[PDB]
Design a protein around this ligand. Structure first.
Ligand SMILES: Nc1nc2c(ncn2[C@@H]2O[C@H](COP(=O)(O)OP(=O)(O)NP(=O)(O)O)[C@@H](O)[C@H]2O)c(=O)[nH]1
Ligand SMILES: [Mg+2]
Length: 265
């Protein structure tokens, strides 16, 4: 069961740390055993399993942008990767016809990391998000959210949500794809919290008898899978549990078909 994720965002926002956090989550039956500034695109693939649901999960890690003087076209490698997977899938459909034998490398969701400035969406992130949402599912997150208080996280989230409407950035789950009243009720709860205020952690700690992922500070451990500490469980549950199939369905029937229709002509 193939599912492909990609992390995107400014350098130094915890993207690579979040990749390891996803694979090391204590909700999987078992975790794979065993980073600095990312210099190349690289994908990790591991068969993970939650109670009943087995997954071949791929997470593509990307070099961060926004450090040079001029960041024009810093979206090309990432957009290039996304369209390459659509191209491979289309060429496989042309050649072998039956999807049973086509490995699905298409990016089913992009997790876009927003700097926890507490202000509003930066023009560079707006430009990147507008280009990304045209071709792939995008779930934005407030990165390294432990640097904001709970109240600051919420106010920043509300401003980002306003910015997304102003610049017409339709992030996942898009309201136009709510197929039912049940979908509207469930997806409105998710849209209320997006962007999730996430914290990443690749280290495990023993806290009150529990082996948990966390960031150890002078004041204690920030437990990244604890809803009282951050909203990583919301991102994790969305991607792997509740909306995995919907993300793949939109990728196949909306984004990939848009690529297939255009390129075939
Ligand atoms: N406070 C805090 N620090 C974090 C968090 N996640 C990662 N960090 C720290 O932030 C730094 C950068 O982490 P990293 O994952 O390498 O960021 P990156 O986005 O992968 N960088 P790049 O794009 O340049 O590879 C490290 O010191 C890491 O320990 C987080 O949720 N909170
Ligand atoms: Mg990195």
């Amino acid at each position: 069961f193939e599912f492909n994720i990609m992390v995107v965002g400014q350098s130094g926002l915890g993207k690579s740390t979040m990749v390891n956090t996803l694979f090391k989550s204590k909700v999987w039956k078992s975790n794979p055993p065993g980073t600095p500034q990312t210099l190349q695109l690289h994908s990790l693939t591991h068969v993970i399993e939650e109670k009943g649901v087995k997954l071949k999960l791929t997470v593509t890690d990307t070099p961060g942008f926004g450090d040079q003087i001029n960041n024009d076209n810093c979206w090309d490698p990432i957009l290039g990767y996304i369209n390459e997977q659509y191209e491979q899938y289309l060429q496989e459909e042309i050649l072998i016809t039956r999807q049973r034998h086509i490995p699905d490398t298409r990016v089913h969701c992009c997790v876009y990391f927003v700097p926890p400035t507490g202000h509003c969406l930066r023009p560079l992130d707006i430009e990147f998000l507008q280009r990304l949402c045209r071709t792939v599912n995008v779930v934005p997150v407030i990165a390294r959210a432990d640097s904001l208080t709970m109240e600051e996280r919420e106010a920043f989230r509300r401003r980002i949500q306003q910015n997304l409407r102003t610049h017409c950035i339709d992030v996942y789950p898009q309201m136009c794809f709510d197929e039912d009243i049940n979908d509207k009720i469930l997806n409105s709860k998710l849209r209320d919290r997006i962007p999730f205020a996430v914290v990443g952690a690749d280290q495990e700690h023993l806290v009150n008898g529990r082996c948990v992922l966390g960031r150890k500070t002078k004041w204690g451990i920030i437990e990244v899978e604890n809803m009282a500490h951050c909203e990583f469980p919301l991102l994790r549950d969305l991607l792997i549990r509740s909306h995995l199939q919907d993300l793949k369905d939109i990728t196949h029937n909306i984004h990939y078909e848009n690529y297939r229709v255009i390129r075939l002509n």
